[model samples]
Target: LVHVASVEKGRSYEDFQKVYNAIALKLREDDEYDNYIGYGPVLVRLAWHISGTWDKHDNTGGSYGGTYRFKKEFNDPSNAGLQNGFKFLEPIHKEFPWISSGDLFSLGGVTAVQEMQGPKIPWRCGRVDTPEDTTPDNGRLPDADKDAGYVRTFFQRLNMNDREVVALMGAHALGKTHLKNSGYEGGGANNVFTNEFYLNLLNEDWKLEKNDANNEQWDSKSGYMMLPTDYSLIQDPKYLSIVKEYANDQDKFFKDFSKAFEKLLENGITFPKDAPSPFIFKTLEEQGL
Candidate 1:
């Protein structure tokens, strides 16, 4: 089925920006969550998980349906640690109850990224909620223990190419993986947003070890870790080249990540040709906050 954009009635840039600011303010206020990494990283993950449900073949999943509001998507094993991000948005949703679930989920990520000084993601709104029947079954998300081939094929379901896959994975720079959450641990500084994920992938001497969960993960003395899928970026020549490019050029990484992330969020939804141009929101820093 074709999912056409149906923007919320009478809402415009300022309205969405209002919602964005609420999320940003809450992110700033909720400083103690996730060890002061704030809600930024998981928010990014939340946005991706919501959109990642998209199956390009039939256009069933994706941010369009807001199925994460349903039990199935929320309970997906892959989404284990994302409830904190959801709970963080609860009050924001109460404040701006008019915003659709899908838009809120995606916008929360946008807010977190820009607020954390990551990148300016151009965002659009118009996701209406759907019934529980529309929720995609679990097991759609990628496995962390897989290799490059698995990474490539998994993203193909979302119509993402190697460049997009590698760029999207750059989000790992924001948060660490919990052993209970995904059977993996550590990634980057667990708070800062940077191309440090690529830098670590390229520079770290990662030792393979099985954690108490009996899952294989790569560990380093610096308290960083890489899932097998993350390690695949360096093992695959094509992905490695892109990883090196991002690791060496922060600006390039930011620019590419912004575009790729926006695309990821919009994967299954079709925007009307006349839909307003994407909005580049002003960060709180720019707003003199």
Candidate 2:
């Protein structure tokens, strides 16, 4: 049950940076995806889905093992629309086949966030993929149709706290839940990452309405939408305060989100004492690319 971290063969920071650059460049070039929402949002979701399967008690499922490539995990109904994200990464994998699947999957999210002008997540290089047998069973991921209590209890499985839960939920601002994607009717998209998810939760006049999927979602006059779980941030007194804090303070939110997300992706792995420090990648614009 001890999944030790090991950098892929002789790969170094530059090796992974090349893979990051390829993913970033393609993210920009593939502008027509999901009607110009591009691959950024899906990429982020992909990383989360891959990592979210972790169960801290057993340490079985996590980003430490890139088990999503197998049939059981990939075909899990919980991951219905994530194939789009997988398809997007295929080309990059082919080009930089040296990187482990767990590394690629998690790094995709990190790259997507930074490329979209979000916080810089310091990522480690090692995540040795386990065998197909290590793929986690389905239902480990959280459902979007729950309340504050449910959201709190659900994330506890991943060991996320109140602030971590609130900050991680900020990813909802990335892209809209498309109707065709998972049968939940939603519209609009925002590729750039920010504290908008928290701002919208506090500011919008949301009314509960059932979508075509018969799921209750909070809809607003501005065409923004939130699942019951998302709206729950403002419903629970404790989560509500954190939501308001993130809404009011952009810098604090970014810093908190960077820490929370990195923790989320690194949950089930153990890095050695002498391992290289986590890398902070430069954005394409920062590199003048």
Candidate 3:
């Protein structure tokens, strides 16, 4: 079950680094999106949702297949607002037509994070395109309406432990949950990447309220909202401790999140033991943007 690297013909680090730069430049250029929140967070969530479909037990659905381009996955009920993220990558794909769909999708997130001043996520390329039939059925992604136990159990299917789940959940600080898209709303600064999600959760005096969609969510006067699943992090002792640790130490959260996010992206893909180590791309700033 060793998944050999499907590196695009003659493509290597320098080539992929160019792709990363393309994405980063656009992220800075597209500064007007989402009320100045930009495209960074959605790109990150898009990467997560695409990879989150993986079932480690069978390795059925994951970013490796790139079936998300198919209508079956594109129209998934869970993927409401992600179309924007997909559309953002269209020009990049057009520019580098040889890059696999999975690679592009995952790389977009990595580029977005670093450009937004988040941790550097190591990434690998080799996912091949698969047919629409390979797309996992709808409902594979987690439901925000569920409880903490459901959050813990759902991630187990992805082979993520308590620490990974909490660390990954910190990403919510990056994007708002659209009422039209997911029946949730409100969040902190959408452009800058920070541990504000954990800080908000631990410090905010959130009141349970129903949004326009009539779904229960934790809301605060700070114009932030938390899904039930997010609230579960504090309700569950183990998740709460991680939340507090991340809130208190931004550096630790970024480091933990980098590992968890990379692991999340690579789920269900079997890389050969001898495969090259992951690539850590230089940020746009590092390259003198």
List TM-score per model, in order: 0.98, 0.98, 0.97
Model 2 per-residue lDDT tens digits across residues 1-289? 7888898888888888888899999999999998789999999999999999999899989998999999999998888888999999999999988888999999999999999999999999799878888888998998887889999998999999999999999999988886656656674499999999988988889889988887778898799999888898999999999999999999999999999999999999999998989989888898888
- Clash number for every model? 0, 0, 0
Error of 2 at 119 (Å): 0.4
Residue range 129-183, candidate 1, lDDT tens digits = 9999999999999988889999999999999998899999999888888888988
Model 1, residue 126: displacement in angstroms? 0.6
lDDT of each: 0.91, 0.90, 0.89
Give the poorly placed runs of model 3, Cα more than 4 Å off. Answer: 1-3
- Residue 64 lDDT, candidate 3, scale 0-100: 90
What is the C-alpha local distance difference test score of candidate 1?
0.91
Q: What are the per-residue Cα lDDT tens digits for candidate 3 across 1-289?
A: 3344577777889999999999999998998889888999999988998999998877888889888899888899899999999999999999999999999999998998888899999999888887788889988999998888999999999999999999999888886877788877777757788999998998899999988888999989988889999999999999999899999999999999999999999987777776667999999899887
